[PDB]
Amino acid sequence: MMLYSGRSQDGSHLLKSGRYLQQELPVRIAHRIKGFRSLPFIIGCNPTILHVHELYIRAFQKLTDFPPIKDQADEAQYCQLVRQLLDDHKDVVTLLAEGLRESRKHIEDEKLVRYFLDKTLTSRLGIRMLATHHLALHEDKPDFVGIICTRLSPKKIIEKWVDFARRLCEHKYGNAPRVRINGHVAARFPFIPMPLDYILPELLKNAMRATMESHLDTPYNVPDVVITIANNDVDLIIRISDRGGGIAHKDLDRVMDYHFTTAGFGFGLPTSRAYAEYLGGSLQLQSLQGIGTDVYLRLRHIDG
Amino acid sequence: MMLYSGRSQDGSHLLKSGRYLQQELPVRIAHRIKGFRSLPFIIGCNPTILHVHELYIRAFQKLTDFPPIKDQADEAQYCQLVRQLLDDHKDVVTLLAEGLRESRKHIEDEKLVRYFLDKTLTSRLGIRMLATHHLALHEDKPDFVGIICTRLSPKKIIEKWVDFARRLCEHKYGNAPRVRINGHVAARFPFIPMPLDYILPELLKNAMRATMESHLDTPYNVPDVVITIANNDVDLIIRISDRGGGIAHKDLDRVMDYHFTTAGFGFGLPTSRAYAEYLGGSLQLQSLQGIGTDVYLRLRHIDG
Numbered sequence: 001m002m003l004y005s006g007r008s009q010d011g012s013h014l015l016k017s018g019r020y021l022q023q024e025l026p027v028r029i030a031h032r033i034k035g036f037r038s039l040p041f042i043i044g045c046n047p048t049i050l051h052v053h054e055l056y057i058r059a060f061q062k063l064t065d066f067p068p069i070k071d072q073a074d075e076a077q078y079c080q081l082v083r084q085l086l087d088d089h090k091d092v093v094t095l096l097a098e099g100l101r102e103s104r105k106h107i108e109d110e111k112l113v114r115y116f117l118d119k120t121l122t123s124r125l126g127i128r129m130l131a132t133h134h135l136a137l138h139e140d141k142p143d144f145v146g147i148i149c150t151r152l153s154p155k156k157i158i159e160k161w162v163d164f165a166r167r168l169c170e171h172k173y174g175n176a177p178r179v180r181i182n183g184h185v186a187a188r189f190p191f192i193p194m195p196l197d198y199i200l201p202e203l204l205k206n207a208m209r210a211t212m213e214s215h216l217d218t219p220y221n222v223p224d225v226v227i228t229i230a231n232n233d234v235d236l237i238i239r240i241s242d243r244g245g246g247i248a249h250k251d252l253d254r255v256m257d258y259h260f261t262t263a264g265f266g267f268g269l270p271t272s273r274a275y276a277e278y279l280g281g282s283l284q285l286q287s288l289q290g291i292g293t294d295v296y297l298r299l300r301h302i303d304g
Numbered sequence: 305m306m307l308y309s310g311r312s313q314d315g316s317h318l319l320k321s322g323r324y325l326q327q328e329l330p331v332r333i334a335h336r337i338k339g340f341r342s343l344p345f346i347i348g349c350n351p352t353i354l355h356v357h358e359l360y361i362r363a364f365q366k367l368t369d370f371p372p373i374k375d376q377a378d379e380a381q382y383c384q385l386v387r388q389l390l391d392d393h394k395d396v397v398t399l400l401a402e403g404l405r406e407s408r409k410h411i412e413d414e415k416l417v418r419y420f421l422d423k424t425l426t427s428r429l430g431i432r433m434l435a436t437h438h439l440a441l442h443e444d445k446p447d448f449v450g451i452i453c454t455r456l457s458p459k460k461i462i463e464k465w466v467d468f469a470r471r472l473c474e475h476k477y478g479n480a481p482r483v484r485i486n487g488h489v490a491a492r493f494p495f496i497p498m499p500l501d502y503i504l505p506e507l508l509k510n511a512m513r514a515t516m517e518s519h520l521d522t523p524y525n526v527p528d529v530v531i532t533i534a535n536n537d538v539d540l541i542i543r544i545s546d547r548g549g550g551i552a553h554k555d556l557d558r559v560m561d562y563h564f565t566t567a568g569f570g571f572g573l574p575t576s577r578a579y580a581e582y583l584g585g586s587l588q589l590q591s592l593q594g595i596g597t598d599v600y601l602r603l604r605h606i607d608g
């Protein structure tokens with residue numbers, strides 16, 4: 001899938017973008033529907049899975065019922081539909097999580113659900129990126145072409161999610177680790193924030209929770225979480241290192257499983273990894289049992 | 305292979321150990337000889353490889369020519385032979401490195417040399433551990449049963465090799481990174497130092513070299529190397545983190561190859577990894593291109 005960076009005054013680029021989207025969305029939704037159709041019967045019969053399956057069918061119906069975009073008037077209305085659908089599907093990850101939680105235990109091939117979720121959630125991420133990019137082309141935000149930031153600062157977006165995770169953590173525990181950021185703190189480059197907006201808060205919540213739950217005697221004095229930024233011509237690496245006691249040997253082969261948690265609902269890690277790999281990067285964990293965990297998020301740079 | 309921890313005043317345990325060694329060594333040397341016999345012809349014909357092949361045949365001959373140990377007198381003489389052989393074989397890794405350097409380019413299956421070296425060097429490590437353990441049983445060192453230290457301090461043995469690597473580094477560059485050690489600095493537990501004596505200096509030399517070569521403008525002021533110790537009931541983890549600029553993407557899939565170097569002779573990494581895995585652990589690298597590298601040495605704890 002491609003995110004149009006084209007620009008024009010007659011607004012011709014919006015028409016071209018809209019037409020591309022109109023061509024592309026129905027095909028990709030059709031693929032998601034095929035995924036639901038192939039789910040093991042007993043899982044497909046779960047009422048929450050059925051609800052999500054039906055949402056996708058509705059999306060496909062509405063998208064295919066929309067006439068070919070001929071002019072700006074049409075394109076404007078197509079954007080209304082896209083906005084509606086994005087909103088109607090905003091809770092899909094949570095619905096799948098709930099729908100699958102019990103039902104998946106009823107089949108033996110455990111690879112199956114993992115594959116379905118990886119494929120479904122990453123396709124969905126790409127679909128939402130495409131659609132949101134098109135809508136964003138109508139915005140006049142400085143330093144954005146659609147959802148592409150022309151000068152993203154890793155430090156700034158990390159700090160945004162740090163503040164967010166610290167507030168949640170402070171609410172639950174009365175305090176939160178301080179976060180230090182080092183390495184290429186001054187880096188700025190073209191980049192799409194959206195995947196970071198998903199991934200960063202998941203990894204930060206994990207690191208903070210781990211830190212608090214291993215320092216229950218001294219909640220007022222916990223070890224910092226330390227984030228290192230490395231920017232090179234190939235990828236961006238963000239290392240998130242905590243002293244939260246590590247991931248136990250007995251849990252290590254399970255933490256990347258959808259639904260596994262030692263506590264939200266165990267999607268943070270497998271989802272983040274699937275997203276990173278979908279975009280050409282990776283998510284790798286290094287556990288120092290008894291000390292802490294290093295998490296390495298790598299995302300490939302944009303090809304201008 | 306098993307390292308006898310048995311003890312006795314009549315010296316009966318030395319006889320039992322000697323007899324075990326006498327049973328075990330010829331079989332293991334025979335396996336190494338079979339490895340040389342199966343090397344690709346053109347490699348096996350290299351005069352340095354032939355020399356090493358012949359050393360192993362000699363070892364096998366001497367070991368099999370030694371009569372069955374009947375008493376302390378015999379056992380004492382068997383130890384002389386073992387000492388001689390250990391000394392005669394002390395440069396084997398270097399000879400294999402040289403012998404293989406050019407010759408390996410003459411075959412296409414590159415997996416072949418890697419497999420031969422992994423198998424040969426790890427078997428050799430185990431053979432030397434067994435033999436050195438037997439000799440050591442005659443020593444009266446406090447806190448040792450043979451080569452097994454009953455209360456090893458990871459911090460102490462790390463500091464030993466830090467001092468060693470810093471001296472080499474200081475000699476070549478006029479300075480050396482300081483090394484900080486954190487985590488479980490007070491840990492003490494039963495452990496066999498020998499593999500650490502190989503591995504630690506290799507990883508420290510790498511980290512220090514990388515650090516100096518990336519700070520050629522400020523040799524008098526370079527970033528510390530930071531070592532973290534994590535001790536748990538399953539394994540010992542030693543993380544060696546540097547700010548030496550990382551391992552480049554173009555080099556990453558090559559650094560674990562025997563002979564690959566960007567400069568000694570490119571054996572440090574593949575050998576250390578083979579040793580760690582041989583003993584039930586691992587050696588893993590995390591490169592932050594543009595910043596530095598984290599190296600994780602994991603070694604499984606001793607089963608008492």
Ligand SMILES: Nc1ncnc2c1ncn2[C@@H]1O[C@H](COP(=O)(O)OP(=O)(O)O)[C@@H](O)[C@H]1O
Binds near residue numbers: 242263268
């Ligand atoms: N930084 C960390 N330190 C220790 N444990 C962690 C860390 N990150 C993740 N984990 C473990 O992995 C499990 C799964 O994490 P995740 O998939 O994000 O789901 P959740 O946070 O909802 O449990 C967590 O329950 C926790 O046990």
Ligand SMILES: Nc1ncnc2c1ncn2[C@@H]1O[C@H](COP(=O)(O)OP(=O)(O)O)[C@@H](O)[C@H]1O
Binds near residue numbers: 506566570
């Ligand atoms: N900590 C490190 N930082 C940067 N590069 C490294 C590091 N460790 C190893 N390397 C790279 O890996 C290569 C192979 O290392 P090694 O197998 O120990 O052989 P050698 O040190 O003899 O080159 C080195 O030449 C170097 O390019």
Ligand SMILES: CC(C)C[C@@H](Cl)C(=O)O
Binds near residue numbers: 085
């Ligand atoms: C555009 C829209 C159908 C989005 C879907 Cl892919 C979803 O978010 O689940």
Ligand SMILES: CC(C)C[C@@H](Cl)C(=O)O
Binds near residue numbers: 393394427428431432
């Ligand atoms: C005991 C002796 C033959 C050692 C050999 Cl395995 C070697 O160091 O190469």
Ligand SMILES: [K+]
Binds near residue numbers: 255257259261269
């Ligand atoms: K999980």
Ligand SMILES: [K+]
Binds near residue numbers: 559562563564565574
């Ligand atoms: K190498």
Ligand SMILES: [Mg+2]
Binds near residue numbers: 264266
């Ligand atoms: Mg989580």
Ligand SMILES: [Mg+2]
Binds near residue numbers: 568570573
């Ligand atoms: Mg080396």
